[PDB]
Amino acid sequence: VLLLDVTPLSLGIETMGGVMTTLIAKNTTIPTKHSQVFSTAEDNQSAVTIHVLQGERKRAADNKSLGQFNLDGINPAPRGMPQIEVTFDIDADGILHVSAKDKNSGKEQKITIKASSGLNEDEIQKMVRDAEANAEADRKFEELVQTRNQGDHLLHSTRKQVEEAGDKLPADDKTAIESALTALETALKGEDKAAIEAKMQELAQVSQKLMEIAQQQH
Amino acid sequence: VLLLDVTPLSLGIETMGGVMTTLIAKNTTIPTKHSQVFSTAEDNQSAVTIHVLQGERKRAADNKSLGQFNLDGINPAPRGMPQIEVTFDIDADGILHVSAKDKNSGKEQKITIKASSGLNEDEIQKMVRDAEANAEADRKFEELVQTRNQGDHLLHSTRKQVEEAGDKLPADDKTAIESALTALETALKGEDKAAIEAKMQELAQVSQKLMEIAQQQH
Amino acid sequence: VLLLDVTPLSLGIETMGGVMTTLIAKNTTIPTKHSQVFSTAEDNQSAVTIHVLQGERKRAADNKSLGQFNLDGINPAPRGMPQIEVTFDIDADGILHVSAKDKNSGKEQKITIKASSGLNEDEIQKMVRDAEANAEADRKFEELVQTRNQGDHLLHSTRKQVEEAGDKLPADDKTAIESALTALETALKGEDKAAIEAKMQELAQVSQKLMEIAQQQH
Amino acid sequence: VLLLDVTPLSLGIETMGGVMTTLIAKNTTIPTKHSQVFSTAEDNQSAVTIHVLQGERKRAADNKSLGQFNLDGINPAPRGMPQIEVTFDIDADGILHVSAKDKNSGKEQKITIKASSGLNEDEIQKMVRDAEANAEADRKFEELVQTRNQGDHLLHSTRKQVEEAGDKLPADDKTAIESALTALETALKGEDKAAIEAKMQELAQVSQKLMEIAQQQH
Amino acid sequence: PRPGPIY
């Protein structure tokens, strides 16, 4: 072949923390099809938003939005339990089909994005240059999002474990634990990574008895 | 400057599923220092192994092992709760210091790896070429590991939720759920991604009442 | 756009010394059109061979031959004087048209190469890897070809200047010069770069009076 | 090795037409040493300027000047005959030594450039981005310089061949030829590539008898 | 709302 039709930029979705998660890499030859399973981020969440992105930046807001749609009707479940399979499918014609399917109900929603959508050649080359220019700042953002996300998971799991512990947890530990939870919930709202790590560390240091109780319970 | 001293290859650690998680990217100028927090993969795990890697492959076993060491003394806790902070620090002399610290106890262990360790120039260029040659197969492996890991998390969380539900779960659902758990536990041992996804989907389809109970409990 | 049709590999022609001279770079979006003017390599040459190449290696014989054709009818002229313009034109359909035109006569010959010619995706990725693996050896070859080519030009120009000098050149210099010409003509037939440079240097050292005569004549 | 000391940018010299000719490629590990032979651009030129460059742009004026020096004492010779060997040598300490040696006399001049010279990390990354942004405009400039340079060579060679022809050239051809030479000399002073190619083509079309005479003479 | 990981 003298040519190849290729994706000039990565294609993906926005995920927890405001980051772009890539489903099809930059420079993939078409046709191609890739899927990844995602879940809900909150207890009893009934809908998830699929925001389709094109570009190479780590911050979703720094990429080109190709559109969005919601999958609703998700049944009541703890965060992290439902399985929403997201498929990016680019056919021979260069048309992008993005689908989200709830694996429990088999309910599906789709967006179709024609071959001419997204960034033009001038914008693609600016995108490529910016991603390279900003590699370092993008890495810092990605490390912060990972920290915040782990903090959020620890916040919620620890709250659940306090409840299941009930009376087994000494009153003094519950006091120490609840204060550190408030402090971490506050810190998660900012973008100071060190502060999140410090509240996470305070939690770990005061939760040792809770931890033993939770392990014992299962 | 007419030169820069740079990392010719990524540096990282082996994480759940046998994958390389990168801490310092290929082509980073030294000195540099980066950290990421990790956790345990099993309930009541008392030690984690830090296996240091150099290279660009997704499979840890396809990279150059720079050494390994264990952090023990982790206190009894549910999987996913303990915070083990891993720091990769390369000083002005090109020496790599890797430390793991338990944020609960402040217990730390380190490996020091001198500037001359790892792959020589012939091996680095073979590594660079192989990673490029194998981009596709490495992507397939990474998607499989992600699937297996999500399966493992769903396996364990669902077992925990059955226990906390106790009598609230109807006997018939518990039967359906326990069968699907056995089937998924089996599937996680292989490398058939579709099969893992099919057992995960069977679980989701039979767990809707359990899910409602678990959400209700918190 | 969600796709771009691009050239997966450079396209070019074989030029003096057995090297690939690129006309369209790897990763150029189509349609595109580029030209470069070339000349003859021998006195009184009546035809030039246009050997079309695809790939990224410096040695023409290491790239994929897409075909060849000759432009004949070039009028008697010293080497280096005729102007043969070579155009590579890839249209919207991905078809490559290569033309050579003699700017004196306006005589033209063409080869047309359809979009499906050349290396398949497996071969393209092997080509990309090999070029990278071999960057160093390819550089050595390119430096040797440049040396040989300069040697050949010096050989022929010096022979011309001896003839135009005639009697003005002292008999002793002509003897020194003619011996060094024989030695350089021999050395050009091998691939020992240092040897070519040593015969070129011997020539320079014995030609100082010839040089003065030649400058004086114009 | 965990690090490599590498050249973050190409190193080279300015050559005929205002272009950068690279002697050491971007990303070369040190120590390294490379040479290339150059010549004079004018008849009876007694000195050549070696202007050392760092960067990846095709226009010399768009790269970082690391310094310059002249090699003089070149003996009277036609353009293109003298051999000036230029060596770029970077030692274990990262120090760049650039030497120019006249292979006829063995006369040499050098510049030494310490490891801390040239662009800092902020400027290197701007340079890398700019080169990528400007790939196309740089290609256009390189094609123009090649055209002008060929035009200049044809201008001068044709003037030499007129002189050696003398009376053999018909008066009418000499008139046509001399007019086209004036027109091409003018066109070489601008940056209109098409115009240079049109005057070069006019020359070729009126020089066919001169060409035959020149070939016959040798 | 946003999607997160399966745990």
Next chain:
Amino acid sequence: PRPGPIY
């Protein structure tokens, strides 16, 4: 044993 994610 191996490290995994904080959840």
Next chain:
Amino acid sequence: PRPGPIY
């Protein structure tokens, strides 16, 4: 035969 440079 092969093409070379204009000189």
Next chain:
Amino acid sequence: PRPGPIY
């Protein structure tokens, strides 16, 4: 002045 090619 500038360097050019050997021809």
